[PDB]
Amino acid sequence: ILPSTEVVRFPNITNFCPFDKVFNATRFPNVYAWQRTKISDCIADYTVLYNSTSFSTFKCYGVSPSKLIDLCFTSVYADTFLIRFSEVRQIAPGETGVIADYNYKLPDDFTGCVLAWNTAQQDIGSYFYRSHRAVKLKPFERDLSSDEN
């Protein structure tokens, strides 16, 4: 015996998913005050972003970017922020730096996708980052104390 045909059956969901209100906000938040948006009841097309958005880093841990079509997620959260161009390499499990110690730590049992793109023309101005914390953060934690020292 050998398999034949496909019995692919996915849930009857008709909503298209708000990528423009999570990837193209007017201004992304600071790294020390990163926002988390719960994404629910939508379809993960990943193909409306193939035009006019050049993805500088798309690294998935636990799953693969070639298999994101075939999977339906129980729940998705999106942590969104904006950093320097050389500090993108610090967003990975098991790593230390400024962003990975004092602003945003990722857990060791991570199962997700880090997606970062360079944009030096959309966001012009000045941003803030934490660099003098006494104790390193626990994973997926936030700190807003400006004068804790």
Ligand X SMILES: *[C@@H]1O[C@H](CO)[C@@H](O[C@@H]2O[C@H](CO)[C@@H](O)[C@H](O)[C@H]2NC(C)=O)[C@H](O)[C@H]1NC(C)=O
Site string for ligand NAG, 1-20 (x = CB under 6 A): -----------x-------x
Q: Which is nearer to ligand NAG, 50 or 85 (CB)?
A: 50
Let me know: does 17 contact 68? Beta carbons within 8 Å. Answer: no
* CA 31 – CA 134 distance, rounded (Å): 18
Based on the shown chain and the rule CB under 6 A, indicate whether residue 52 belongs to the binding site for ligand X.
yes
- The CB-side HSE value for 57 (13 A sphere, CA atoms) comes to 16
Based on the shown chain and the rule CB under 8 A, indicate whether residue 75 belongs to the binding site for another protein.
no
Residues 83-142 that bind another protein (CB under 8 A): 93-95, 108
CA nearest to 31, candidates 93, 87, 77, 95: 87
Residues that bind another protein in the complex, under the rule CB under 8 A: 1-12, 62-64, 66-67, 70-72, 93-95, 108
